[PDB]
CSV table of N, CA and C in Angstrom, one decimal:
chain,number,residue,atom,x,y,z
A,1,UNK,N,52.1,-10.5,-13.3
A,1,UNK,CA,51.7,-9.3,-12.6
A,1,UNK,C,50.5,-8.7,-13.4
A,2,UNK,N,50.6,-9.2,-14.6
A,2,UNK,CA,49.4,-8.0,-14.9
A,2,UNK,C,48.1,-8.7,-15.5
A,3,UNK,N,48.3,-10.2,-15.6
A,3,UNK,CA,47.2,-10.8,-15.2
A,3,UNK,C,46.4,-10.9,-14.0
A,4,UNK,N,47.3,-11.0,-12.7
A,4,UNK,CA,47.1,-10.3,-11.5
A,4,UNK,C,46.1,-9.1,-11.1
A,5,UNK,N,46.8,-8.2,-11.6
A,5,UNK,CA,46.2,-6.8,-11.9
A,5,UNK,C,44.4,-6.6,-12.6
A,6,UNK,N,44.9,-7.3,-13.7
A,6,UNK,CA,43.7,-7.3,-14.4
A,6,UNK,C,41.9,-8.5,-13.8
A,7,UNK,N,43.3,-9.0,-13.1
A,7,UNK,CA,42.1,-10.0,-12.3
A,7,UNK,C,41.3,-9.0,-11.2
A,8,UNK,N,42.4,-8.2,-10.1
A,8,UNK,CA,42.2,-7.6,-8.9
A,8,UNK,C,40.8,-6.4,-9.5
A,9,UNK,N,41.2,-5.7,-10.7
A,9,UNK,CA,40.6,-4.9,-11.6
A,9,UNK,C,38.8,-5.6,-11.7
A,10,UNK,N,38.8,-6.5,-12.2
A,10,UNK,CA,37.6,-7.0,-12.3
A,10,UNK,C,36.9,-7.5,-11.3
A,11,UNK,N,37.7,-8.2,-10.3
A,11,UNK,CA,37.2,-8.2,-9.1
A,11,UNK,C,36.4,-7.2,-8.0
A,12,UNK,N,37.5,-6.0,-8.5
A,12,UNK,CA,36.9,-4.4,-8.0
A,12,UNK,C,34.7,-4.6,-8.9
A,13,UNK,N,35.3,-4.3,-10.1
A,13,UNK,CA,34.0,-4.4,-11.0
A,13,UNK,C,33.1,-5.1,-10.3
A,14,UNK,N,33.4,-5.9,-10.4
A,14,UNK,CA,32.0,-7.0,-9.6
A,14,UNK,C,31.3,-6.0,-8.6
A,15,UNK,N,32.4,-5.8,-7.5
A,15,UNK,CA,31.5,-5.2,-6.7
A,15,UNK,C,30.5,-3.9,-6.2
A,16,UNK,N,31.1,-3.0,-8.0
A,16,UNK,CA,30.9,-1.8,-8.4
A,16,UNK,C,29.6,-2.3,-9.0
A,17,UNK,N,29.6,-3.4,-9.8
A,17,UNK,CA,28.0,-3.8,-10.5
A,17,UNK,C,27.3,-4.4,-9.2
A,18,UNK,N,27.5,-4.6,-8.2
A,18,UNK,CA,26.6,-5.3,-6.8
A,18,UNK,C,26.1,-4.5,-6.4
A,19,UNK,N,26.7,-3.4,-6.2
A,19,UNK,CA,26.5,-2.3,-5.5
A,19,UNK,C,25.4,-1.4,-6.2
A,20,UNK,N,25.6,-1.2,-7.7
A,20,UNK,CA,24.9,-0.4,-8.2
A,20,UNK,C,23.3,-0.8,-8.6
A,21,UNK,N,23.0,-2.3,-8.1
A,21,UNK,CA,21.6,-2.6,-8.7
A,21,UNK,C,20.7,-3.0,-7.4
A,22,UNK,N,20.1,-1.2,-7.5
A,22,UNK,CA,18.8,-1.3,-6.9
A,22,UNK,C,17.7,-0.4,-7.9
A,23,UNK,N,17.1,-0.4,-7.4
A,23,UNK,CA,15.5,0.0,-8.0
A,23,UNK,C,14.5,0.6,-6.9
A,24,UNK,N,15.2,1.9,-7.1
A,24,UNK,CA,14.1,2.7,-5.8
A,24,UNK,C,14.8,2.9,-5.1
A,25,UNK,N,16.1,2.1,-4.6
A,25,UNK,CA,16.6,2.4,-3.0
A,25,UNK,C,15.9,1.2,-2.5
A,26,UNK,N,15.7,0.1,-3.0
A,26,UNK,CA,15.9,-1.3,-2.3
A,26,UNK,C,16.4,-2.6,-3.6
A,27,UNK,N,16.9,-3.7,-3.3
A,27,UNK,CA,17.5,-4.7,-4.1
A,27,UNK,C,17.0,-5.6,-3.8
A,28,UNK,N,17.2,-6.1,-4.3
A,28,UNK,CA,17.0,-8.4,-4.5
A,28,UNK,C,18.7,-9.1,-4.3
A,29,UNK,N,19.2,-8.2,-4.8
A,29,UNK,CA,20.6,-9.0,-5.0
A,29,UNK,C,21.5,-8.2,-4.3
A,30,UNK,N,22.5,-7.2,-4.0
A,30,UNK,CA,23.1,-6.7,-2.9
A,30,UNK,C,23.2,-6.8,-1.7
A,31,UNK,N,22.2,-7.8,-1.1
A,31,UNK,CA,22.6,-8.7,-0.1
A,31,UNK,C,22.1,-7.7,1.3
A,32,UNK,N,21.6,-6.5,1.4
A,32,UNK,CA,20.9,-5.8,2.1
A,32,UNK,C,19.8,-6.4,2.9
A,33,UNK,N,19.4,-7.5,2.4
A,33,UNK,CA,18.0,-7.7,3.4
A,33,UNK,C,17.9,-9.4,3.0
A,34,UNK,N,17.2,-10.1,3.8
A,34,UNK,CA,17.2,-11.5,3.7
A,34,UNK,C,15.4,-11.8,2.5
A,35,UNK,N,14.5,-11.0,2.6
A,35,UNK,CA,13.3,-11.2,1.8
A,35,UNK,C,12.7,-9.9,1.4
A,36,UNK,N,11.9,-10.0,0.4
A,36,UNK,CA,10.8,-9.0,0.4
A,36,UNK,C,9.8,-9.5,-0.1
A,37,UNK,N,8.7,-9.0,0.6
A,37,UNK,CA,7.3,-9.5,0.5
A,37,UNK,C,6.3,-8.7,0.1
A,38,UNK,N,5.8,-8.8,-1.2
A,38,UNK,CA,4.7,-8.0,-2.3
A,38,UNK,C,3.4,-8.8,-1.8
A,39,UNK,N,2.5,-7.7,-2.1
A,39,UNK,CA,1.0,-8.1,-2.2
A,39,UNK,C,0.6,-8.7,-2.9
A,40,UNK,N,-0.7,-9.9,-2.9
A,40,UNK,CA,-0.9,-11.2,-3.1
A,40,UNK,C,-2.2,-11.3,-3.4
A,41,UNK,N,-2.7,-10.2,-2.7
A,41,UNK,CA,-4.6,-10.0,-2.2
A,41,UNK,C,-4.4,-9.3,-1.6
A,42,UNK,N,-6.1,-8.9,-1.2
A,42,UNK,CA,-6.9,-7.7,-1.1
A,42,UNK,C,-6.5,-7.9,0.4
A,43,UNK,N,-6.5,-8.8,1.1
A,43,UNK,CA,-6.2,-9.0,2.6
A,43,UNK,C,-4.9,-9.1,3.4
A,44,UNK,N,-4.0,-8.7,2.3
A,44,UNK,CA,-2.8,-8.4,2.7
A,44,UNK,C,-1.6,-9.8,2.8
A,45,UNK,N,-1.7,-10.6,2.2
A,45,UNK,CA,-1.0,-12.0,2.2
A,45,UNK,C,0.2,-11.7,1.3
A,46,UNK,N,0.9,-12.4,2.0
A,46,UNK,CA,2.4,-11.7,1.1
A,46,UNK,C,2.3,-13.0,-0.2
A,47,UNK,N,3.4,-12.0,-1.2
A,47,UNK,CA,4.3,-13.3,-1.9
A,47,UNK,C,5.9,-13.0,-2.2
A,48,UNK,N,6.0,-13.8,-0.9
A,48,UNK,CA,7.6,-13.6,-0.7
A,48,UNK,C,8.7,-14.1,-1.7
A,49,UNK,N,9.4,-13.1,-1.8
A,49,UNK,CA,10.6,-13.5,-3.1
A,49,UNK,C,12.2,-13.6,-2.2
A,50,UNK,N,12.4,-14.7,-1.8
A,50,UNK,CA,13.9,-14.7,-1.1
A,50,UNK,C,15.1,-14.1,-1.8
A,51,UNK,N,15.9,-13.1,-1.2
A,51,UNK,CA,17.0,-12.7,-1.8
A,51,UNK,C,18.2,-13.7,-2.6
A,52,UNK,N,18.8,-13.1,-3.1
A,52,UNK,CA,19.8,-14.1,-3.9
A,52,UNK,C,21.3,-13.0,-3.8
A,53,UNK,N,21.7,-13.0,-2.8
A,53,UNK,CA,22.6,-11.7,-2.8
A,53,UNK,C,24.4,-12.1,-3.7
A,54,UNK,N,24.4,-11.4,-4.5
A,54,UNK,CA,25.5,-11.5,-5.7
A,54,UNK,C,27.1,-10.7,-5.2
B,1,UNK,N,-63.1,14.3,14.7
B,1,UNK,CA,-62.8,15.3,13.8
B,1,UNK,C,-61.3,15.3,14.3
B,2,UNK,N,-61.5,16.2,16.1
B,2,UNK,CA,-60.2,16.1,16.5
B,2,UNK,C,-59.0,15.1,16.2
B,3,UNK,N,-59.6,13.8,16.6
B,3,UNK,CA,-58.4,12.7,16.5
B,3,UNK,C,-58.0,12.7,14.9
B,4,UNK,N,-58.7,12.8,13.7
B,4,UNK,CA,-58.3,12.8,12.4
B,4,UNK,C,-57.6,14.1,12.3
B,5,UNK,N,-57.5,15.6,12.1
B,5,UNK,CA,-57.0,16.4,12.6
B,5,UNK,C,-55.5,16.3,13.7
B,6,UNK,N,-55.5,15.7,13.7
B,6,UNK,CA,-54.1,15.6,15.1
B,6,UNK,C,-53.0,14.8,14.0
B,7,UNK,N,-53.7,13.9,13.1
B,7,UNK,CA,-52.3,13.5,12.5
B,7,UNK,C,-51.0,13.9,11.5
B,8,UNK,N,-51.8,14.8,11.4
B,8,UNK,CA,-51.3,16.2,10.4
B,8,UNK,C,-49.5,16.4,10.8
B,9,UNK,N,-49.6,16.4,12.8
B,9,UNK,CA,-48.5,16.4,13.2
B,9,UNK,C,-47.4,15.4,13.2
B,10,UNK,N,-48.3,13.8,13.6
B,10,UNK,CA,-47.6,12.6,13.1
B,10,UNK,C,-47.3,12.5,11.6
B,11,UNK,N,-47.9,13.3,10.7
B,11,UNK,CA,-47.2,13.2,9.0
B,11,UNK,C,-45.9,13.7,9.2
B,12,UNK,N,-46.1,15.4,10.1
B,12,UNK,CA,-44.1,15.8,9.7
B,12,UNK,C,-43.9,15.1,10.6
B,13,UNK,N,-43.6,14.7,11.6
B,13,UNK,CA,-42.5,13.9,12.5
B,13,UNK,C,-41.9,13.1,11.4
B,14,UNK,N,-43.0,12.4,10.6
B,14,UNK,CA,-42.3,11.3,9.9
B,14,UNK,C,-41.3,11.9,8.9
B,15,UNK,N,-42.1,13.3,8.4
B,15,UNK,CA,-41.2,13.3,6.8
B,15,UNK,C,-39.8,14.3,7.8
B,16,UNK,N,-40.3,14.8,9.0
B,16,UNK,CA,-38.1,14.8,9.5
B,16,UNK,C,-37.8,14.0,9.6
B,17,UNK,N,-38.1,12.6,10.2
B,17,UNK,CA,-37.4,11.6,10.6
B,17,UNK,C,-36.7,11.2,9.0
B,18,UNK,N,-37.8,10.8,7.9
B,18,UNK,CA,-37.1,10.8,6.4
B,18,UNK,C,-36.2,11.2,6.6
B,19,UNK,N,-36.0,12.8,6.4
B,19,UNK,CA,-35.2,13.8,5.8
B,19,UNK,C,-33.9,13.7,6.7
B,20,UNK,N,-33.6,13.6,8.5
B,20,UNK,CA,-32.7,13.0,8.6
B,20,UNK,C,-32.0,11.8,8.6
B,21,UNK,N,-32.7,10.8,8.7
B,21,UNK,CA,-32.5,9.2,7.7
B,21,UNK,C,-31.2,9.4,6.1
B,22,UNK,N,-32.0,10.6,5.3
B,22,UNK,CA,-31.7,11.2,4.6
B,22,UNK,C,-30.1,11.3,4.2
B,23,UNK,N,-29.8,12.7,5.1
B,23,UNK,CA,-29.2,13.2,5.4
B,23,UNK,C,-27.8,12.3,6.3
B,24,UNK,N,-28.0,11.2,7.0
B,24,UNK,CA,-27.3,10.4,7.5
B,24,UNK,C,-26.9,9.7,6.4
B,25,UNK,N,-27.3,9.0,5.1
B,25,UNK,CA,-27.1,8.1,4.4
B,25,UNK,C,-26.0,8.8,3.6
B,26,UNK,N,-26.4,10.1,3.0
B,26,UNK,CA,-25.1,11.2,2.2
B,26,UNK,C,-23.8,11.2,3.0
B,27,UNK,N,-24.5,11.6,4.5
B,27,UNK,CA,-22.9,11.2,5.2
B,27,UNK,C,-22.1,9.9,5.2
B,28,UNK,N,-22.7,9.0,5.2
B,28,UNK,CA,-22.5,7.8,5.4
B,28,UNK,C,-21.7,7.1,3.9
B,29,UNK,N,-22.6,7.6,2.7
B,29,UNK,CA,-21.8,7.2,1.5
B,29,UNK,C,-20.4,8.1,1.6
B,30,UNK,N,-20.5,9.3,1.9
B,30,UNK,CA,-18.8,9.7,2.1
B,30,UNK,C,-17.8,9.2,3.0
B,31,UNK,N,-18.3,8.6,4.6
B,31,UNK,CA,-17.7,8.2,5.0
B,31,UNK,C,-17.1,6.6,4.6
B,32,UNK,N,-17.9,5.8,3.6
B,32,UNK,CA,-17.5,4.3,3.3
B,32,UNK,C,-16.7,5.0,1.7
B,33,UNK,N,-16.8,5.7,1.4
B,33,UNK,CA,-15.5,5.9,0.3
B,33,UNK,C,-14.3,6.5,0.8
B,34,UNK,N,-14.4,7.3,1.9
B,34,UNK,CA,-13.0,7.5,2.8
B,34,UNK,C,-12.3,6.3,3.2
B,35,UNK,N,-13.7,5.4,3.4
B,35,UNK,CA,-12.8,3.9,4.4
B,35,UNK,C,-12.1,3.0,3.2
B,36,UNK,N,-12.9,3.0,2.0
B,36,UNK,CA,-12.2,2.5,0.8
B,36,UNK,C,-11.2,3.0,0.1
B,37,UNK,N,-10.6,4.5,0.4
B,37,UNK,CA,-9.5,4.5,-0.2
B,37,UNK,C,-8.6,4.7,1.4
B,38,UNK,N,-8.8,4.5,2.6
B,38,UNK,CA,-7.9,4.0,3.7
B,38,UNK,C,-7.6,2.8,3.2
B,39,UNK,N,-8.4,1.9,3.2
B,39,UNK,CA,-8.0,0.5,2.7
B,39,UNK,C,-6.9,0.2,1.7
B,40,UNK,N,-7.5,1.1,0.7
B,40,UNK,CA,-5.9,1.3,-0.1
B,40,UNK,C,-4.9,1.6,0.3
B,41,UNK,N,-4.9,2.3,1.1
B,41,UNK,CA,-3.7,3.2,1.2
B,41,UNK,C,-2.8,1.9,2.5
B,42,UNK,N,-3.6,1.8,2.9
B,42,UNK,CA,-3.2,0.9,3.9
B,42,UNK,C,-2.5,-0.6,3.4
B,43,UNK,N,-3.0,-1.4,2.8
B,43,UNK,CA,-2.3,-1.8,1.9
B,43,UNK,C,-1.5,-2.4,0.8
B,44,UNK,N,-1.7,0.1,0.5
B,44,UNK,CA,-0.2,0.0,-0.7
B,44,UNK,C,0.9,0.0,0.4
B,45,UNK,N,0.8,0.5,2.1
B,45,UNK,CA,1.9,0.9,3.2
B,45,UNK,C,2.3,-0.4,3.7
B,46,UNK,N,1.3,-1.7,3.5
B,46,UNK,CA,1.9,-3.0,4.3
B,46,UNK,C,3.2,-3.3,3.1
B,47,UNK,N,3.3,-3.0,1.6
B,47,UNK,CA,4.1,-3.7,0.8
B,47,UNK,C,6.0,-3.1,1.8
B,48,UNK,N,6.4,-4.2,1.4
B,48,UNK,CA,8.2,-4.3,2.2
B,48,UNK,C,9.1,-3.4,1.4
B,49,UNK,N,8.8,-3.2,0.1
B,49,UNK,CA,9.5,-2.9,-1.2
B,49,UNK,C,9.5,-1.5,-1.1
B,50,UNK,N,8.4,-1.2,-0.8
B,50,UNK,CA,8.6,0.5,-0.7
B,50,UNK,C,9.7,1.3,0.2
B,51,UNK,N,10.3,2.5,-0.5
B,51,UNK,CA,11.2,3.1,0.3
B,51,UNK,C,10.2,4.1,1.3
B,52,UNK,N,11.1,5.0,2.0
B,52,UNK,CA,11.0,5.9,2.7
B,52,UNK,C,9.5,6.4,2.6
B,53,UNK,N,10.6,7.3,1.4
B,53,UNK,CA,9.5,8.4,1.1
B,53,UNK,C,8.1,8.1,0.7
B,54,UNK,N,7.8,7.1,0.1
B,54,UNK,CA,6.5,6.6,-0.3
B,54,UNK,C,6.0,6.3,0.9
B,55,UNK,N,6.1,5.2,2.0
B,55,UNK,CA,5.7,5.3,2.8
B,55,UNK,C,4.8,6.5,3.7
């Protein structure tokens, strides 16, 4: 039981640390969005970074 | 005499025409530095990453 516990406990954690990593009010990893796409050039060409949601 | 005499008036036509030639080019350099920091502005607004409020 209280290996149990201490499992359910960290399991909670995980998703207190998923939850908590953004930057600005958008993430890469929280699983919120499938890409984001930064500037590349002057003419607006992305360079897309695919999510990795944790 | 007359015809040498009469061009006195073709000299200003020209130096207004100059002066608004002039006058259009000053406007003209302020309006291509408004269009260059549109350009900016336009796309820092294409980037995905930005929240709300920046936008």
């Amino acid at each position: 039981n209280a290996l149990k516990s201490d499992f359910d406990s960290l399991r909670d954690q995980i998703t207190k640390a998923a939850s908590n990593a953004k930057f600005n009010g958008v993430s890469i990893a929280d699983g919120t969005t499938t890409k984001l796409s930064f500037l590349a050039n002057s003419d607006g060409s992305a360079f897309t970074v695919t999510a990795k949601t944790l | 005499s007359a015809t040498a005499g009469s061009m006195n008036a073709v000299k200003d036509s020209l130096q207004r025409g100059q002066s608004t030639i002039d006058v259009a080019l000053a406007a003209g350099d302020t309006i291509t530095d408004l269009l260059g920091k549109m350009k900016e502005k336009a796309l820092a607004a294409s980037d995905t990453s930005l929240n709300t409020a920046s936008f």
